[PDB]
A paper describes a structure:
IMPase is a key enzyme in the intracellular phosphatidyl­inositol (PI) signalling pathway, whereby IMPase dephos­phorylates inositol 1-, 3- or 4-phosphate, collectively known as InsP1, to produce myo-inositol, also known as free inositol. Cleavage of InsP1 into myo-inositol by IMPase is required for the recycling of inositol for subsequent use in the PI signalling pathway. One enzyme inhibited by lithium is inositol monophos­phatase, which has led to rational drug design targeting IMPase as a strategy for developing novel therapies for bipolar disorder. One such IMPase inhibitor is ebselen [2-phenyl-1,2-benz­isoselenazol-3(2H)-one], an organoselenium compound which functions as a glutathione peroxidase mimic.
In this structure, ebselen is in an open-ring conformation, with the Se atom forming a selenosulfide bond to the sulfur group of Cys141, which is consistent with the known binding mechanism of ebselen. IMPase contains seven cysteine residues, amino acids 8, 24, 125, 141, 184, 201 and 218; of these residues, only Cys218 is near the active site. IMPase is a dimeric enzyme and in the crystal structure two adjacent dimers share four ebselen molecules, creating a tetramer with approximate 222 symmetry. The binding of ebselen to the Cys141 residue in each monomer does not lead to noticeable changes in conformation in the active site that would prevent the catalytic activity of IMPase. In the crystal structure presented in this publication, the active site in the tetramer is still accessible, suggesting that ebselen may function as an allosteric inhibitor or may block the binding of partner proteins. Previous research suggested that Cys218 is the primary reactive cysteine residue, which is supported by the reduced inhibition of C218A mutant IMPase by ebselen. However, whilst this structure clearly shows ebselen bound to Cys141 in each monomer of IMPase, our structure does not rule out the possibility that Cys218 could be modified in vivo. There is evidence that modulation of IMPase away from the active site and dimer interface can affect activity; synthetic peptides that disrupt IMPase–calbindin interactions prevent calbindin-mediated activation of IMPase and mediate antidepressant-like effects in mice. It is possible that ebselen interferes with accessory protein binding, possibly by formation of the tetramer seen in the crystal, to moderate the activity of IMPase in vivo.
Residue numbers in the entry:
A (entry chain AAA): 4 to 277
B (entry chain BBB): 3 to 277
C-alpha cells in the first residue's frame, strides 16, 4: 500500500546511516547556518541529496521537505501530495563531536498526515519504525510507552534549543525549572529531537517537549511515539501541528497536559509561513 | 604492579555487577526513597553493593570501603590513606528505574587518598571503561583519548541537574547552565549518570563535564579514566580537584576546564568528609 514506500524508506535510512556512521570517524569541516551553534557539514548535505534523488527516482510524483533543502531555498509547505520529510542528520552537533546519538529521520505524509516514520540512530545501530495502525518497532522489538501518569515520578527529555538569545535561553531554562521543581525524577538531553522522541516511544523516558524544532525533527518520530501508544500535542496544549515548531510527545495525555500547564510558550515562526 | 591484581579483580567484579544490573533492569522493580522523593534506590543497588563489598573484603580483608548505599546505611564517607574501594553500585539509578539506557557500575581504588585505578562498566551498552594510573584508559580494549578542542565556543559539555529540588538551588544550577550555554558552547547534554558523562569526556565524544553535588563514588572510578585518556580534573573554583568536595570539572584540557570554572557560581554542599 504505502508498505512499499516504507520498506524503501527503511533501506534508504539504513544506507544514509551507513554514510553518516562512516563520516563520523573522519575529520570534518564544520560550517554554520543561522548562528554560531547552528551547524552543518557536507555529510548533512550529501545524505539529503542522496535521499531526495533516490526517492525522486522511485516515486517521481512525490513531494519533499528536507532540512538542508530548505536551507538552500526550498519551501517548507506541506500539501496533500505524498511528501517525504527528511532530516538527513538529526544531531549534527553530536555528529561533529562524535557524541553517540546521531539519527537519520524520514517522515512520510499524505493529506498532511504522517503515514509512516523511520528514525535510524546510526551509532547505536537502532532502527525505529512505525506505520499508521501497525505499531512501532525498534530493531523489530515492538515498542510501548511507559504507563506513568504521575508527573512527580516522570523522566523527561528536552533540549535547550538553538537560540542563544539571553531572553529566549532564560525562558527555556525557566520552563525547565518549573518542570524540574514539580518535581520530576529527572530531565535528560541526548542532543537530538528524533532520538529523544524515540526514547519516549520505548518507555525509557516518559515525555519529551521542545520549542523551536521543525517539521523534519518530529515527522519521523512522532508516529513512532503514537504507534507505541503515546500522544502528541502542542506545548500550548493545542493539537499537534507539524509546522508549529512546538511539541510535547508523551506516553499519555495526563503527563502531556501536566507539562503543557508549565510551559511558557516562546513565539516562533511557523515552518509553513514567511 | 602491587595494585594490578586489585584492578584485574575489580574488572571481574564490575562485569559481574553489570550482569546483575542488566538482568534486573528488564524486570519489576521496587523503587525506594533515600533523602527525598527524587533520590532513589532499588534492591539491585543494595544487592550489588553488598556483593562487591563482600567479594573485596574476602580477597583484601585489610582494605577500606566507601560505598554509596553503605554510607546511606550509616558508614563513613571520609577517605583515609588506607587502600580504599570507592563504589557506586548503580550510577544512574533514576535511569535504571525508568529503563533509560545509561546505567553504570563504578569502582575507584585509592591509596594515600590518590586514585590508582578506576573501572566503570556501562552495562546497557556493554562498555567496560578502565584506567590504571600511568597506563592509559581503555574502553573494551580500545585506548581512549580526549578531544583536542580548546575553543569553548566549539565545545560540547555534559552535566546533570542534580538531586536537589529546592528552587534556590535549582536556580543556581540553571544559572550556571545559562552562563555556559550563552558563551556560547555548542550544546550541553545529560545522559543521567556522572560516571558515564565523564567516560564520554574520556572518549572525546564530549569535551568536558562539570557538576556540583556529586559524591566521591560518582567520580572516583571515572576521573582517572578521564585523566588517563589525557584530560584533567579540576575543582569548580579552578583549584585542584578534591575528591571529597562534591564538585568536579573533568575536561579534555586545562583551557576548557578553566574557562568553565570562570562561569560557575558555587553552590553550598556538605562535603563527603563532613557530617
Ligand atoms: Se532497538 C530497542 C529499544 C528498546 C528496547 C529494546 C530494543 C532492542 O534492540 N531489542 C531487541 C531487538 C532485537 C533483538 C533483541 C532485542
Ligand atoms: O567499543 C569500542 N571500540 C571497540 C571496537 C571494536 C572492538 C572492541 C572495542 C569503543 C570505541 C570508542 C569509544 C568507546 C568504546 Se568501548
Ligand atoms: Mn539535521
Ligand atoms: Mn543514589
Ligand atoms: Mn548510585
Ligand atoms: Na541542522
Ligand atoms: Na534536526
Ligand atoms: Na568535542
Ligand atoms: Na540538538
Ligand atoms: Na506552575
Ligand atoms: Na551516583
Ligand atoms: Na519512565
Ligand atoms: Na580552533
Amino acid at each position: 500500500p504505502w508498505q512499499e514506500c516504507m520498506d524503501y524508506a527503511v533501506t534508504l535510512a539504513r544506507q544514509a546511516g551507513e554514510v553518516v556512521c562512516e563520516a563520523i570517524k573522519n575529520e570534518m569541516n564544520v560550517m554554520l547556518k543561522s548562528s554560531p551553534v547552528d551547524l552543518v557539514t557536507a555529510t548533512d548535505q550529501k545524505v539529503e541529496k542522496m535521499l531526495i534523488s533516490s526517492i525522486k527516482e522511485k516515486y517521481p510524483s512525490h513531494s519533499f521537505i528536507g532540512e538542508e533543502s530548505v536551507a538552500a531555498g526550498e519551501k517548507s509547505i506541506l500539501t496533500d501530495n505524498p511528501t517525504w520529510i527528511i532530516d538527513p542528520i538529526d544531531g549534527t552537533t553530536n555528529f561533529v563531536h562524535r557524541f553517540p546519538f546521531v539519527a537519520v529521520s524520514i517522515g512520510f505524509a499524505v493529506n498532511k498526515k504522517i503515514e509512516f516514520g523511520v528514525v535510524y540512530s546510526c551509532v547505536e545501530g537502532k532502527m525505529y519504525t512505525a506505520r499508521k495502525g501497525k505499531g512501532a518497532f525498534c530493531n523489530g522489538q515492538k515498542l510501548q510507552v511507559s504507563q506513568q501518569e504521575d508527573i512527580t515520578k516522570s523522566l523527561l527529555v528536552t533540549e535547550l534549543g538553538s537560540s542563544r538569545t539571553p531572553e529566549t535561553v532564560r525562558m527555556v531554562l525557566s520552563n525547565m525549572e518549573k518542570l524540574f521543581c514539580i518535581p520530576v525524577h529527572g530531565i535528560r538531553s541526548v542532543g537530538t529531537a528524533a532520538v529523544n522522541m524515540c526514547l519516549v516511544a520505548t518507555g525509557g523516558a516518559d515525555a519529551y517537549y521542545e520549542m523551536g524544532i521543525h517539521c523534519w525533527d518530529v515527522a519521523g518520530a512522532g508516529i513512532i511515539v503514537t504507534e507505541a501508544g503515546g500522544v502528541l500535542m502542542d506545548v500550548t496544549g493545542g493539537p499537534f501541528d507539524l509546522m508549529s515548531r512546538r511539541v510535547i510527545a508523551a506516553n499519555n495525555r495526563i503527563l502531556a497536559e501536566r507539562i503543557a500547564k508549565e510551559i511558557q510558550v516562546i513565539p516562533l515562526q511557523r515552518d509553513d509561513e514567511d
